[PDB]
Write a protein that binds this ligand. Structure first.
Ligand SMILES: [Ca+2]
Lengths: 188, 103, 51, 51, 51, 51, 51, 51
């Protein structure tokens, strides 16, 4: 209702190449995501020659074209090896998490400052029934004053495309039950 | 030499399918009834007294079709067929412009 | 200006021809506007005196 | 007057509209946007009819 | 005239439509797109009746 | 005629429909699609009633 | 008959419905989903009246 | 009967409702969710009237 209206309205006051970058995002989400994560590690001629730079910065300006006015709580899943936990919490066909893996994760994700990078889609509400949940770790993030959020539609739902120039700080992790599976909700 | 009424077909007179070389209703059925003139099929088609006295003679009422609305079929994100927001009048003018007609 | 002539189509769309094919080719010049001029004309009038 | 006689009113079905069920993103069955008229002609055009 | 005699009007129920409740993306219960008619035919064709 | 006598008309509430307010994604209160009827049977089913 | 005498009809307002406006980053004001009735009771319940 | 005399009917416009247009980077103009009523009160409060 609200997000549908505002999203369908932002998809008009976008520049034609901005909508180009947004629609070619729905094709190369993984590829343009990784390239936004690792674009800055080249030579300059290796930068302005790369055909993805056009859509990259078009998408970046589209995002930063609408910054929020007050802090927001977002939710998104993450893999454990994003936080240097190179083991598995549990395989997504298992239903339980052992206290040992919980203690190991808590020991390894409590005292670091994980820099983030590139674009990523997030949500404004916790996962429910029908949403896809491939990873056991659920990151509940707080986006502050003036952070670009772009709401787009994959023909039935809404995603919030943001860019990550921050560093997330884990506060507390708890083990959660959702639909008879055991995930981890970590406050960041 | 004068138009009594111009009627657009409402729910009672809309044909759900019409394949090429076919009719609605089909070949073996009896024709529709074009009874009403308003939008909700509750107002019949009137004539006045002079037109009725004209009908009580050899004068016949002719019927001309000035346009037809209808949809085409397209497949959505899934394998379904959507024929709702797909109007043919969006292309009736464009086809008539880039074509030669053959009958 | 992206729309010099003030109409819904840009200069590139009008120059290249990526618009309605029923649009006159006059309007394919970025200075001439795609514009309909519609008017109604009455042909005869019937009166029905409801006595 | 024609009906206050031996004559009868016959009824003919000229078409029937209806929906079909489809399981959406979650386990819910949806029958709203789904119309059989979208497939009547397609089915009749690739098939033999056995009765 | 039939009714001003022993003749009575009976009532028969041919069908009933209604909704069911599901939790939406929040803790809220939704009963709008949910329609029991989508499942009435499916349940009857997979089960045995007991009264 | 029965009303021009000692007979009166009573009034009985068979049900009442309404809404509740929640805060949407921002600090705005919404009461539009939030119906109390979704929660009446469920609240009555898990409670004791004290008056 | 009462009205064709000293009797007068009074008018009293029982409720008033209306919208508020909410801007955006720019000065885009929207007054459609914004209903004052969502906040009337909440304001009356945390306040002191001064006239 | 009062009108079949020197009496005339005056006409007073109490309010006017209408839209404004908002262009994208192309020439796409929308005039639907755009009401001047959202801004009449705000303009008449930060301004000085000159005629
Ligand atoms: Ca230009």
């Amino acid at each position: 209702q609200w997000e549908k209206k505002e999203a369908e309205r932002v998809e008009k006051n976008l520049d034609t190449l901005e909508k180009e970058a947004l629609e070619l995002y729905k094709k190369d989400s993984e590829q343009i995501s990784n390239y936004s994560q690792t674009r800055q590690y080249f030579y300059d001629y290796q930068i302005e020659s790369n055909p993805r730079e056009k859509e990259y910065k078009n998408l970046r300006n589209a995002i930063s074209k609408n910054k929020i006015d007050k802090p927001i709580n977002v939710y998104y899943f993450e893999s454990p090896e994003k936080f240097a936990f190179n083991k598995e919490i549990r395989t997504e066909n298992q239903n339980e998490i052992s206290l040992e893996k919980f203690n190991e994760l808590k020991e390894t994700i409590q005292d670091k400052l994980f820099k983030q990078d590139g674009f990523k889609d997030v949500s404004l509400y916790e996962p429910g029934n029908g949403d896809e949940k491939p990873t056991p770790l659920l990151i509940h993030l707080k986006l502050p004053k003036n952070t670009g959020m772009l709401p787009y539609i994959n023909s039935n739902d809404v995603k919030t495309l943001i860019e990550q120039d921050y560093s997330i700080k884990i506060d507390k992790i708890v083990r959660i039950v959702i639909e008879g599976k055991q995930y981890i909700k970590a406050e960041a | 030499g004068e138009t009594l009424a111009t009627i657009k077909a409402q729910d009672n007179q809309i044909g759900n399918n019409l394949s090429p070389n076919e009719t609605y209703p089909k070949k073996g059925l009896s024709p529709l009834a074009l009874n009403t003139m308003d939008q909700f099929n509750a107002r019949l088609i009137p004539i006045n007294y002079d037109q009725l006295k004209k009908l009580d003679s050899g004068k016949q009422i002719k019927l001309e079709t000035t346009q037809v609305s209808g949809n085409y079929g397209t497949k959505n994100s899934q394998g379904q067929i959507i024929t709702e927001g797909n109007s043919w009048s969006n292309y009736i003018s464009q086809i008539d412009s880039v074509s030669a007609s053959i009958i | 200006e992206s729309n010099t002539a003030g109409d819904p189509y840009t200069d590139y769309q009008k120059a290249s021809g990526s618009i309605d094919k029923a649009i006159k080719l006059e309007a394919r010049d970025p200075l001439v506007a795609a514009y309909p001029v519609v008017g109604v004309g009455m042909e005869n009038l019937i009166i029905s005196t409801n006595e």
